[PDB]
């Protein structure tokens, strides 16, 4: 498994990422596409990556570099590759590729699928933070989304959460 940074200059790969993104998330759950293009090539601490299994593109992951830690914004593999082991294989190498602490957001365990996602991440070495986190909306006027953060690496919720939340809301979500 291999991660490779991508620009919109990489026509085939970028379109692959973009199709898979739109098919994986509801429209309210990612930024406007024209903007996503802009972040990709314009924003230096924003990283858009295609995931390979050799030379087979199987996924994408986008993340932000915040010097102390990394924030995973979106992460998806190709749904044709279902029940094939790629989720685990990808998460495994993601922790090799990114060595500073890794932060992501998960849905709160209300539905069965939410509960499964959390145990999946916990099985693979992420700690669940029970802080009252909300994802600010991508589109002005859509809802703030109740979520939890999950962390892999040496960050303690008690000491670090407030500073991380603040970094996320202002830089990723453009609050204030």
Residue-number span of the structural domain to which 96 is assigned: 1-124+146-176
Overall number of domains in the chain: 1
Taking the CB of residue 82, how many other CB atoms lie within 10 A of it? 9
Taking the CB of residue 24, how many other CB atoms lie within 10 A of it? 17
Residue 13 lies inside a defined structural domain of this protein: yes
Residue 139 lies inside a defined structural domain of this protein: no
Residue 138 lies inside a defined structural domain of this protein: no
Q: What is the DSSP letter of 28?
A: G
Give me the phi and psi of 117, to 5 degrees please.
-65, -45
β-strand 46-53 against 102-107: which pairing, if any?
unpaired
Q: How was this structure determined?
A: X-ray
Residue 176 lies inside a defined structural domain of this protein: yes
> Which burial class, exposed, middle or buried, applies to 141 when counting CB atoms under 10 A from its CB (0-12, 13-18, 19+)?
exposed
Residue 76 lies inside a defined structural domain of this protein: yes
Sheet holding 2-5, edge to edge: 2-5, 46-53, 56-65, 70-77, 102-107, 145-152, 127-135
How far apart are the C-alpha atoms of 42 and 110, rounded to whole Å? Answer: 37
Assign residue 88 a region: left if phi > 0, alpha if psi is -120 to 50, beta otherwise? Answer: alpha
What resolution in Å is listed for this PDB structure? 2.2
Residue 137 lies inside a defined structural domain of this protein: no
β-strand 70-77 against 102-107: which pairing, if any?
parallel
CATH number of the domain where residue 52 is located: 3.40.630.30
- Could you tell me the CA-to-CA distances from 118 to 54, 59, 115, 121, 150 in Å, in that order? 28, 20, 5, 5, 8
11 by DSSP, 3-state: which?
helix
Residue 172 lies inside a defined structural domain of this protein: yes
Place of tokens 């709160």: 108
Residue 66 lies inside a defined structural domain of this protein: yes
């Amino acid at each position: 498994i291999r991660f490779q940074p991508i620009t919109t200059s990489d026509v085939q790969h970028y379109k692959f990422m973009e199709e898979l993104l739109v098919e994986s998330f509801p429209p309210e759950e990612y930024r406007e596409l024209e903007h996503l293009r802009e972040y990709t090539d314009r924003i230096g601490n924003f990283h858009n990556n295609i995931i390979f299994d050799d030379d087979l593109p199987i996924g994408f992951i986008t993340y932000w570099d915040f010097d102390e830690f990394y924030y995973v914004e979106h992460f998806a593999t190709n749904p044709a590759l279902r029940n094939g082991g790629y989720g685990k294989r990808t998460l495994e190498h993601l922790c090799e590729f990114l060595k500073r602490p890794i932060v992501l957001e998960v849905e709160r365990p209300v539905e069965e699928m939410a509960k499964r996602r959390i145990n999946f991440y916990q099985r693979h070495g992420f700690t669940l933070w029970e802080k009252d986190y909300y994802q600010p909306p991508y589109k002005e006027g859509d809802d703030f989304l109740p979520m939890y953060l999950m962390v892999h690496g040496n960050l303690d919720a008690e000491k670090d959460y407030e500073g991380i939340r603040h970094k996320l809301h202002t830089i990723v979500y453009g609050v204030k």
